[PDB]
Structure 1
Amino acid sequence: VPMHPFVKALQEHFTAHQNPEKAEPMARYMKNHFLFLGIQTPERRQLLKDIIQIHTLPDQKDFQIIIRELWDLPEREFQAAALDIMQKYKKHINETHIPFLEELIVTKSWWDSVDSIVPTFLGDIFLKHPELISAYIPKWIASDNIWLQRAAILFQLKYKQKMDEELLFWIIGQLHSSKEFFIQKAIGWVLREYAKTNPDVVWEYVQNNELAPLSKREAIKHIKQNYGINN
């Protein structure tokens, strides 16, 4: 069974505009975990738009198939394009897609893909179906996979006043001893971001609970101005 014609077309069109000179520093930026064609986002989005204009967006029955096929291609631009395409099918994504999204998180994993899946797609799903959080978050925290652990931390990133504070701090407490940069930094990020909504609670949390130095520093990057730095 051949690849979907939409994916074959995208592959051909992206490859025709590859830039090996840019691809080298792009690959180094991602610590050489991926091959790159060398196409940056504004052009990549236009090339995708070209293929949609010519071929039309594939029927929804093929949505997951298209995403997986792009996920399996070597160059990182194809996963970036897959995420652009998933945004176009956004109105069709629901709680039944959580395992599909899990699998994307733990394949071809790095911060660029995981941070584009978690606070947006998963965040939206768990906002609508909070009763399902406990069907996934404990497993993710207990996982060997740091990207699932990061997912547990960041799915609430954009919740603002809908933040479940008790949940947030419980998750952070479970992971606060991790020596993994991407976990320490995610804790810092979600605290920094939530501090834009409720700075008092974040300040109290970081002053009174154990965190990695990186996590605490990133959490209070802005709000330390509001409280001051004691002698």
Structure 2
Amino acid sequence: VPMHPFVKALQEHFTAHQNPEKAEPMARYMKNHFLFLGIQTPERRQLLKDIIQIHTLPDQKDFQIIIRELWDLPEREFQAAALDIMQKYKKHINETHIPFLEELIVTKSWWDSVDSIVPTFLGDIFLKHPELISAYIPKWIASDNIWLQRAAILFQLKYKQKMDEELLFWIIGQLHSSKEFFIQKAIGWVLREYAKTNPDVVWEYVQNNELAPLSKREAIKHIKQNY
């Protein structure tokens, strides 16, 4: 459906290199929500490299149209490549793009797209503008969209000594009772990651606060050997 020359070049090049054999197990691993061309990350990045160097990288003022057109293509590689492209415009992404990122988060949703938007792009935005947290995180948690909820839990994933323990546990406190696999796993993930910096605090939270068994188990798996 796309006019942008760059997206058209990319689509032609990727489609030329599809592998129906490599596609089948890729699509299975994503529970068949998406068609795949069958191009693994390294080749995908290389094929994107080719098109970028051939075409040169588009003006940063196009970045949104490029990503949106890619996001509308049926094959999952196009959304993976759209986030690789987004990374090439990192320095031009700022607080004004949070609504654009929310859109990506709730469109063609799955952990593979959401996990590449949240801890990196949104993580850095809220580190720079932590005053905008109140305008988003409570709204996302209240949404009943599990991907926005997952976004609230993971935006701090890579914060290390910058982690706001108070907000983190407040978030996890609102979401612990969720039936949702992707919420339970995200909770366990951020707890295990945070435990790399502050294990004792994670251990005490997990030992004294309600969690789903999946979340608890995922949280302590690399630190249980210490207590």
TM-score tier by shorter-chain length is: over 0.9
Does the 8 Å contact 2:17/2:39 carry over to 1? yes
CA deviation string 1:113-152 (max 9, x = no partner): 0000000000000011111111100000001210000000
Measure the CA separation in 1 of the matches of 2:111 and 2:193: 17
Q: CA deviation at 1:54?
A: 1.0
Measure the CA separation in 1 of the matches of 2:93 and 2:12: 28
Measure the CA separation in 2 of the matches of 1:165 and 1:42: 36
Query: 1:156-171 residue pairs with structure 2 within 5 A?
Result: 156-171=156-171
Distance 1:2 1:148, change over 3 A: closer
Measure the CA separation in 2 of the matches of 1:17 and 1:208: 52
Query: 1:1-231 residue pairs with structure 2 within 5 A?
Result: 3-227=3-227
CA deviation string 1:7-44 (max 9, x = no partner): 00000000000000111111001000000000001111
Q: Secondary structure at the match of 2:79?
A: helix
Q: Secondary structure at the match of 2:33?
A: coil
Measure the CA separation in 2 of the matches of 1:2 and 1:17: 20
Q: Secondary structure at the match of 1:37?
A: coil
Give aligned-pair identity as a percent: 100
CA deviation string 1:163-196 (max 9, x = no partner): 0000000000000000000000000000000001
Which runs of 5 or more structure 2 residues have no equivalent in the other structure?
none
Tell me the TM-score normalized by structure 2: 0.99
Give the total of aligned pairs: 227
Which runs of 5 or more structure 1 residues have no equivalent in the other structure?
none
Distance 1:152 1:64, change over 3 A: same
Q: Pairwise CA RMSD of aligned residues?
A: 0.8
Moved over 2 A (4+): none
Distance 1:42 1:217, change over 3 A: same
CA deviation string 1:44-80 (max 9, x = no partner): 1111011111111111111000000000000000000
Measure the CA separation in 2 of the matches of 1:9 and 1:116: 24
Q: Secondary structure at the match of 1:143?
A: coil
Measure the CA separation in 2 of the matches of 1:2 and 1:78: 12
Measure the CA separation in 2 of the matches of 1:67 and 1:118: 16
Measure the CA separation in 1 of the matches of 2:145 and 2:128: 25
Tell me the TM-score normalized by structure 1: 0.97
Measure the CA separation in 1 of the matches of 2:188 and 2:2: 44
Measure the CA separation in 1 of the matches of 2:47 and 2:186: 32
